[PDB]
Design a protein around this nucleic acid. Sequence first.
RNA 1: UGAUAAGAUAAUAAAUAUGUGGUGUAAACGUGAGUAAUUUUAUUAGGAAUUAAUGAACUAUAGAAUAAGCUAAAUACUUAAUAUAUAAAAAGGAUAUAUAAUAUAUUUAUCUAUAGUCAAGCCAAUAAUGGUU
RNA 2: ACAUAUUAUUAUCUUAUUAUUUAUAUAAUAUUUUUUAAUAAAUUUAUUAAUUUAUAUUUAUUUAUAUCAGAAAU
Lengths: 102, 291, 25, 120
Amino acid sequence: STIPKPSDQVPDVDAFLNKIGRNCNELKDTFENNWNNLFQWDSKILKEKGVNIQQRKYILKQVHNYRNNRPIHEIKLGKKSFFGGERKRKAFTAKWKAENKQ
Amino acid sequence: ASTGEIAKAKLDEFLIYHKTDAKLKPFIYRPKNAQILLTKDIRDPKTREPLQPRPPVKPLSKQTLNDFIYSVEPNSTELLDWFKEWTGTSIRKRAIWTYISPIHVQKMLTASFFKIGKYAHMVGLLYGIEHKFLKAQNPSVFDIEHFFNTNIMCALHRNRLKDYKDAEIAQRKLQVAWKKVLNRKNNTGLANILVATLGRQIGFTPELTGLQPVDISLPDIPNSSSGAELKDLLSKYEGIYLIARTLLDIDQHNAQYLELQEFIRQYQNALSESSDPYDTHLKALGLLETP
Amino acid sequence: SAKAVKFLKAQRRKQKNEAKQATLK
Amino acid sequence: TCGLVRIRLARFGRKNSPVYNIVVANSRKARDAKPIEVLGTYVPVPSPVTKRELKRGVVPIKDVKLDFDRTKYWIGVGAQPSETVTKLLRKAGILNDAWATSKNSNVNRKVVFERMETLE
RNA sequence: UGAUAAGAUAAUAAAUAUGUGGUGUAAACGUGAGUAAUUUUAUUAGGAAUUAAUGAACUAUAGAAUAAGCUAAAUACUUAAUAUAUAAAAAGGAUAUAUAAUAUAUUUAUCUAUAGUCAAGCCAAUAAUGGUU
RNA sequence: ACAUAUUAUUAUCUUAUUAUUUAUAUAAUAUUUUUUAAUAAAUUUAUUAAUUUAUAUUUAUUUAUAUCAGAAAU
Ligand SMILES: [K+]
Ligand SMILES: [K+]
Ligand SMILES: [K+]
Ligand SMILES: [Mg+2]
Ligand SMILES: [Mg+2]
Ligand SMILES: [Mg+2]
Ligand SMILES: [Mg+2]
Ligand SMILES: [Mg+2]
Ligand SMILES: [Mg+2]
Ligand SMILES: [Mg+2]
Ligand SMILES: [Mg+2]
Ligand SMILES: [Mg+2]
């Protein structure tokens, strides 16, 4: 679509790649701090630039959010419980309560 | 061993009892269930040995906390740590939140200033925890005869000892103190005298809403000389002896009032055989100032 | 036994009916 | 989507050539299990328009067959359409803008052609 | 705020799902061991006992949402109050605004009742491999 | 013959667990109930620990019946 305008919280692409997170700060060299490249490159271009499947989809979701004045704060992917997944929690908990508290 | 050590053990036993779970209270404190407790083998928190029977706990005496207050070393955080643990209990434990009386807070504020030397951190624990007292249905503790007067009295000594003379800080602090009072019942009338003395000392005109003029009504201890009845009566009126002696010593304007001197005569002559409360505290303030 | 008392009660009932058939026939 | 009775797409066809049944189904049953009712069919692949037609102004058409009357009955009894089915029903004029969401709300987009009900 | 800084209070911005809680796993998926039918299958314009104060979870409508206790605290749990012979309930959170914790408003939940939708229990008739050595 | 494996059955033996049903407790908890100390507050009342009292809910043991399973016989 159109190119949004830089804000004060997200002045440049590097700030954009740091707020979204998910290790997207490791693509700062792919974009070269070019604001237009971030808001013009689609999936096909990003795939040719070496961005993996998960990251390029995540970036494009945050680019759409920015274009619509929606928050771009990092949302973390889900993680299994400390005591393991439900299917292996009974076993893990039994072996963790006999080696920590006896 | 010492009076303080014994009092602390009694106060710590009382708290442990009321902080125990209700289901487990009959099995840990009723001696007839000592064998039922063993069999259940409930495991003491902190992964310690199974819980063991404890002696039944009976209502604690209000004098117990007065003994602990006056045992705290000259520069210690023991009173400040006990209060923070005592007032950290749930507001549903009525025994814990009703044990504290107006006398206890007066003795916690007068001991902290003249003996323990941590007044600032004792007026912050009381100011900070006043909201919990209201939720725990014990607002009376924050009154004018034990909380406000004691505070203004310690101010009339710190402002001198330290020489503080700002007329803005004093007024702001005086307003906060009055705002912290939840049981505004001026009886002795010493509050008005204390507030006026503060203004003269720090060169401002006090003006607090609701502090209506009250004539002096100092309780006169009778000439009759009893034993534990007059030792309690003196200890009962010990706070107002520290306020009468303070008023005269700080400012000579209070010498005008002759009611103040009558109480001094009565309280001093009542047990002049023993030491002087006012002087005793003054000595410590110097012994704490030197450090 | 409770199972030996139930068995005999049923065995007597079956034998009364087998006899009943003979008396009817 | 919520509820026990949902209007959703059941997948038919072959690999790489999906076609869908518009069905009323119990939430807990398999996607392609025999539903309560088959309301219609959805072919997601638009009909290809020829070079001339494109310049002529023909827009590719996606074809949906639907029982309008029966569909309205199931909405009336509290059946809950899926997001994709909701889009289809809003385009057909059965559902209105009350079923739109914040992400797809076309509050400001020009209308090039207005919904036209005809007979054929 | 605390006359010296330990703490408290509120606002804002974050963190925590190794604490207490809620919802979810009777489904789907896989398999064909058992099962020859008081149980399983299929069928019928079948039936009654003439099927619950059951909603499981959405729809429409109406009303309600009270007091204590227990836990560190609660939309946890327990005991009560009031609600279709009558019986049988509940829960707040978020955000604004005005007040001196309370009230409204918005939003999202909780409980009850009536109907609908989905969905259940039971029975009959008919048929369902081989051997009478 | 028979040595094996599998299954089923029982007027038999043993039996986990559970359901139901007995008897018992100076059993626990709550409330009621009879008193009794200790403590506290106030200047009788409250709390805690006991005792008496019934009530409900549990717990332990116990009686009987059924029961996974195993043994024996067929
Ligand atoms: K498989
Ligand atoms: K099979
Ligand atoms: K609300
Ligand atoms: Mg958790
Ligand atoms: Mg299943
Ligand atoms: Mg379940
Ligand atoms: Mg498959
Ligand atoms: Mg309520
Ligand atoms: Mg509550
Ligand atoms: Mg609940
Ligand atoms: Mg033969
Ligand atoms: Mg058997």
